[PDB]
Amino acid sequence: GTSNRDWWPNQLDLSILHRHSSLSDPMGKDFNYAQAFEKLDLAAVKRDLHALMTTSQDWWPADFGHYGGLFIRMAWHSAGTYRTADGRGGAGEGQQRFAPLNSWPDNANLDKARRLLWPIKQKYGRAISWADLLILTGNVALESMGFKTFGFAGGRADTWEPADVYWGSEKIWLELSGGPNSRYSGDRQLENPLAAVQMGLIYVNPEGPDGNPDPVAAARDIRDTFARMAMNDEETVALIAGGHTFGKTHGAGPASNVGAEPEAAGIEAQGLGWKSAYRTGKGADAITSGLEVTWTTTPTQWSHNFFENLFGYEWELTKSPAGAHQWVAKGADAVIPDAFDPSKKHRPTMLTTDLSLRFDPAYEKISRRFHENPEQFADAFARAWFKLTHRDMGPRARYLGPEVPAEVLLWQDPIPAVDHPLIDAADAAELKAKVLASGLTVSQLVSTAWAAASTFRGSDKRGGANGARIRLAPQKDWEANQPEQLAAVLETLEAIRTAFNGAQRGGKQVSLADLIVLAGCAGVEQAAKNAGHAVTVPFAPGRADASQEQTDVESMAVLEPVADGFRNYLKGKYRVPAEVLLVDKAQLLTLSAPEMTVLLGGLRVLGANVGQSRHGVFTAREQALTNDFFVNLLDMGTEWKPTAADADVFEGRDRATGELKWTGTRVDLVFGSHSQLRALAEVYGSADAQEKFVRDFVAVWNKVMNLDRFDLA
Amino acid sequence: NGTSNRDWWPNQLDLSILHRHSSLSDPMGKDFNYAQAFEKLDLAAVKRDLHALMTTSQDWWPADFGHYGGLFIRMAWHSAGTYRTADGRGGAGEGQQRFAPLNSWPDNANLDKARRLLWPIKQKYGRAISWADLLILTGNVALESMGFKTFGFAGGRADTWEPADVYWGSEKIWLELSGGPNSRYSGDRQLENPLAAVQMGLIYVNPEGPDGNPDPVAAARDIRDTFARMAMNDEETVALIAGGHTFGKTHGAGPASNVGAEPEAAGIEAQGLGWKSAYRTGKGADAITSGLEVTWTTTPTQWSHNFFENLFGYEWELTKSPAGAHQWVAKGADAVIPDAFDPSKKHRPTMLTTDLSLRFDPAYEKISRRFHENPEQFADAFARAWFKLTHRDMGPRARYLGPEVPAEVLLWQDPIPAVDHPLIDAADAAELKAKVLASGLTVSQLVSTAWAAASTFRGSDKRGGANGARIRLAPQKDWEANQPEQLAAVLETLEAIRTAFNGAQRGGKQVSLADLIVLAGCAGVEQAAKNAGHAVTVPFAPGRADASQEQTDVESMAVLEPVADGFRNYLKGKYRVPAEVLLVDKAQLLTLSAPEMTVLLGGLRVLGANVGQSRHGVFTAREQALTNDFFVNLLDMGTEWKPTAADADVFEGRDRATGELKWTGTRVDLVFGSHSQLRALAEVYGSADAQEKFVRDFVAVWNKVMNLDRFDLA
C-alpha cells in the first residue's frame, strides 16, 4: 500500500515523538520495573545462568562445551551500538531483540544466544528485564570463566518497539565506503552521529578497513569508532584483548550457505535466522562472521594468553574457509583446542583488528604493559566492561541491586549526596520573591533555567540541571548559553543563595542547582502574572552541586546544543533542515508533538531566544506568557516569503499593505506549514485557549526541569 | 534519507497502525470529552458566522459569483466522499481532509483554500466545534444560504490529530490509469476491494470518463460501481450528482502545467496551502483546479431546477477546456450561463462526461426524467442523500448531537429500538448465567456465539456489534464464519431461557436476546476460569435491545461479513494479502492495541472459539479452561515448526528430539512466535508469573469487545 512517506519522502517525521505509548506496552500503567527487580532473587538468577553456561542445546551446540564466549559477545554487542554524539544505542533498552539490531549482520547468531536465555527469562518473568538479563548473562559468563567483574546494576526497563535511531543512509547491508550514501567524506571522516564503519557493524570491519587487511589502518578505524563510543585507548585495548581472551569466531564454510536474517526469515523459523546449509549448519560447522579464529589455548578460562600469543608469534596473512582475510602464527605448533574434536588442535590465529593492538604504536605500548602486567590488564578490563555495559544507564540513582560498585566514576557525571534538610514550600516562595526582587528579568530567568535543564537527553539519561554544571566548564562557555549574560545571572543567584543559606538554622541550605531551577520557575510565574494570570509552577528540591573536579570536561562536549530550536539557535550550517533538528531535540527531551509545540510557542514569547533574536517573537508583550505566537503565526492576514539574504529566514508582511510585521526561521514557520504541527498550533491559537496554553506550558516546563530527577523516581 | 526498518523488510507486518491515535499525539487532555463541548456550543451563532462568510470574499482566493457556497459544498462532499463500505474507512467523521494524504490528493485541489477560509470561525469557537463537524456544517450552511432546505445535521465528529492508516491503493503515481503494475482493476473492470475510487487521488470517478475516455455510458458504470461502494444506490446517486452540480462551477482557465506543488510538497512559506498557479493571477477568474471549465446552471448561487432542464433540453457536443480536458457544450445554445467575475460575459451551457451519464445510462435516465418532471421528488431525495452522505460513518443515532438531528429513523442507520422497560439487575444476571450453564451449552459454544455477535463492530464507521441481536437475523445467521448450524442450536437454547425468564417477571422487566447472548458469553468465560481453578468476574452491562429483520438491511449488512477472522482462525478463501496482515487489520477495526490483540487471540484459542473446532493454534491439553497455555506452548523451543507439503499456510510443530507431532498452526497462530514485537508480547504472557495477569487482561479485552457499540453508555 502506498504511504505518506512514499509520496512525500522528505516531509518531517513526527511519529518518533509518539513511540513508546501506553498502547504498545503490555504492562499495566502502574508497573514499576524497579519495584519488581528489587525483589528478584538475583543470586538465584545467577546460579541458573552459571548452570546454563555448560548445558548445551543440540539446536546450537556449545563451543568447547561452554556458551560463555557466545554470551560475552552477546552482551558486548548489546552495549556496543552506543554513540556518544547523541547517546543513542547501547544496552539500556534491550533493543537487540527488535529490528533492525536483531538482524544486523554483526548480530548473526546472537538470536541463538537470546533463545538460550528464554527459559530463565520465563522463569523470573517481569522481575528481570531482557535488557538487564543480556548484561547479567555476560557478567556470569565472565565470572564462570574465572574473571572478577567490577559489579553490576539492574534497572534497564524493557521496551516494546523498535527505537527510531539513525544508523546511516546506506541501502545495502555492509556497504563499503564511497557509495552514493557514503558515511565517510574528506580524509576518512565518519559522519556524526554514526559510530561504525559500515551499515550493520558494531564498530569496525574485522578484516580491516573496507576489507583491506592492514592492521595499522584498521587501528585508525578502531580508535575513531571506540572514541565515538566514549572509550579511550587504554579502555579500547583492554576491551578487545579482554573479550578475545574467550571463545572463537565461526567461518567453517562459505557464507553463501547462510540464509535470511531473522526479520526476513520464514514464519516457521520462529524468530531465528541465518539458517545455514553448510553441513550440520551449527556447532563445528557454524558460520557467523565467516572468520575462523580461536585466540587462546584455554578459550573457556580467563588467562593472559591473548597477549602471550600476540607478541610471542609473527603473523601470516591467510584465508578462512569462507574466504575472509585472517592471520595465523608462523612456525607455531598446534596448541589451540578444537571446539568439538578433542583429538584436534590448531595453530594460533588472529584478526587484522587484533594485530592492530601490536602494530599501532600507541596501542603497542598499552598492550605491552598489559602483557608484562596482567593484573593491570584484568583491572582495566573489569572497569571498561562495567563502563561499556552501564554507559547509557544514567545517573547512579537508577542503579539497582546488591552488586552496584561503590566507587564513583568520573564518567558517571556524579552528583554529590545531599546531607542536609531541604527547603520547604514557604522557603521556595521566599526565594522566588527574592529572585524577582533582584531585578533579574523573566527572559534572564527562563533562559538560564532552560539552558541548565535542556541538556538532558533520554537516549543515555545524561544531562539536566542536577549538578549545577552550567556554572562549570565547559557549559558556562557554550555559545548557546550566552556566556556573559549567564555569568551575570549566576552571580546574582549565588548572592541570593549565600544570603539565604547564611540565615538558616538546622543545617538547611539550598543548592545552586535547585535555585537555578526555582528561579526559572519564578520567571514563568512572573510571566504569567504579566499576562494577567496567577499560577504556581511546581518545584521539587533536592538537586546538588557538582564540582569541577567531579566533571569530565571532554565527555561533556557531546552535550553541547549545537542546534536548539527552542532557543531558535543553530551554531552553524547543517545539511539536515533546522525543523528536523528541532524534532530530534524534542525526542531527546522526551517530548511529544503537543509538548514540543506548547513549549516552543511559550519560550518565544518569554525571551528565550539566544541573542535576543526577534525571529519567531510574534508578540507585542514579550515576557508575558500568552498564546500570541500561535494566534499571530496562524493569522492569514500575514504573508510570508524567504529573504534574499538568507533563504532560511522569512519575512511576515501584511498581505494588504506590505508592511513588515515579523521575521521567523524554519523552526518558527514549520508550525504553520506541517499539517500535523499546524493542527496543534490551531488548538493553542484558538480564542478559548488561554487557560489551556498556560496550564500546558507550566506542565511541560516542569517536566523539562525534572528530566534527570531519578532521585524522585 | 535515513534507512528504516520498512526499507530493509518491506513486507514485515506493521503494528504501528494499532498504536495510532495515542494520548501522546493528542493535544487535548485525556479526559476531554468533545460531546460535552459541542453540546454547549452556540450552534446558531456558528451558523450566522458561516452565513456571513459565504459572501465575504478574500483576495487571496476570490469567491466565484461573489459566493463561496459551491466551493464549500464540494469541500463537504469531498470530506464525506472518501468513504468505503467495504471496511467503513474514509468519510467525514474524523476530519481527515486536513491531514496527509487527503489534504493533497489531486481531487482535493484548492480545498486547502476552503479550509483556510474557515480558520477564523474555528478559532473563534475553539474546541467546542471540531474541524470534522465544521466541514459538514459549512456545507449545510452553503446549501441553506443558496436556498436549499436541508434534512438536518448532527454534531459529534471528534477531531483526530494524525493521519489515519488507510489503504488507498498500491499505485506509486498520482492518478495512474488502469492496467499498470499496481492496477486496482482486473478482469472486466473489477475494482479491488476495499477501494471505492477509479484512480489514486480521486474521490469516486474520473470526470472525463473511464481512464480519460469521454464515454458517458461507460462512465456511468464506474459511477454506479464506486457509488455503490460508498453505500449509495441509483436514486441516491443521481440525486447527489445533479443536486451538487446545481451549484457553482469547475476551474480550468489555463494549462495544468501552471499549477505547482500540492500542500505536502510545497515550501514552508506556503504555510500549509498548495497548488499555487503561475496562470495569470492564479486565482478567481484565472483559477485552475480540475482542469475542466464547466458551469452547470444559469443561477450557480441559487438552488434551481436548471440542471435537468439543461441536461435534457440540449444535445451535447464533445469539446475541450482551456487546459485540454474533455467536456461537453450545448449545441446551438445561446450564452445564458453567467460568468463568475465579468458581468459582461455569458457562456453556453456545459456538462461533464459524468453528468451526461445521468441521461445516457438507461437506468439513470429514468430517474433523471422523473426528477426533471417532479422537482419536489428531486429536492427531497437530494436532501435525504446529502444527510446520508455526510452521516454514513457516524454510527448509531446515539452518537448524534445537537438541536438539528432529524427525528426520522433511517434504515441505513441500522437502528436499534428504544428500551422501554426495567433492565435486569445483578441478581437477575446471576440467575441467568446459572440457567445458561445448567442448559448444557459448553464454554466453546457460549464464547464462540458471543464473539460472533460482538466482533462485527468496526470503529471506522461504528457499524456492527452485539447490540440489536442481529446475529439471529439474515444475513448474519447464515455467515460461514458464524457456524450457522451450531449457532442455531445455541440461539434456540438461549431463546428458550429468555422466554422462561421473561414470562416469570413482573413490572415489565425483561431481558433482550442481545443482552442474553453477551451474558451467556460472559458465563462461558467465567466457567472457563473455574475450569482452570480460578475465581473470576466478568463485567456485564445490560441495555442492548433487539432489532427486527425489517430494521436490518440485508445488503448493507453484507459488508460486515468476516471473511478473515484470525481470532477464530478463519479464512473464507485464499487472498493475496497474508493472513497475519488481515489479523492486524481486524484488530484495528476492533480498536485493539497489540497487547490486546495478543491476549485476546491466545485466550480465544484455548476456549474453543475456532471455526469448525479446528485444532490449529489450540496449544493446550485443557481446552475450555482459561489459561495462558497458548503462549507457554507456542514459545517452547522444544518444538520445531515446518510448513506442510499439502498446504504451505499450515504448519506442524514437532518435538525437536523425537519428531513426534505435537501441534498444528496457521500463519495467524505462528506469527506470535515470529514477529519480533509480537513475540515480545507473547513472552510476557507466557512467563511463569503471568497466569493471573493473562486472566485479568483477557477479561478486560473481552469486556471491551462486548461493549464496543455501547454508545448508550458513552
Ligand code: HEM
Ligand atoms: C575492534 C573491535 C572488535 C572486533 C573487530 C571484533 C570482532 C569479532 C568477530 C568478527 C567475532 C566472530 C563472530 C563469529 O564469527 O562468531 C568476534 C567474537 C567475539 N568477540 Fe569480538 N571484536 C571486537 C571487540 C570485542 C569486544 C570489545 C569484546 C568484549 C569485551 C568482544 C568479545 C568477543 C567474544 C567473547 C567473541 C567470541 C564469541 C564466541 O565464542 O561465540 N569482541 N569478535
Ligand code: HEM
Ligand atoms: C460522479 C460524481 C462526480 C464527479 C465526477 C464530480 C466532478 C467534479 C469536478 C471535476 C468538479 C470541479 C472541481 C474544480 O475544478 O473546481 C466538481 C465541482 C463540484 N461538485 Fe462535483 N462531481 C461529482 C459528484 C458531486 C457530488 C455528489 C456533489 C455534492 C452533492 C458535488 C458537488 C460539487 C460542487 C458544488 C462543485 C462546484 C465547486 C465550486 O463551485 O467551486 N459533485 N465536481
Ligand code: NA
Ligand atoms: Na541510548
Ligand code: NA
Ligand atoms: Na471511516
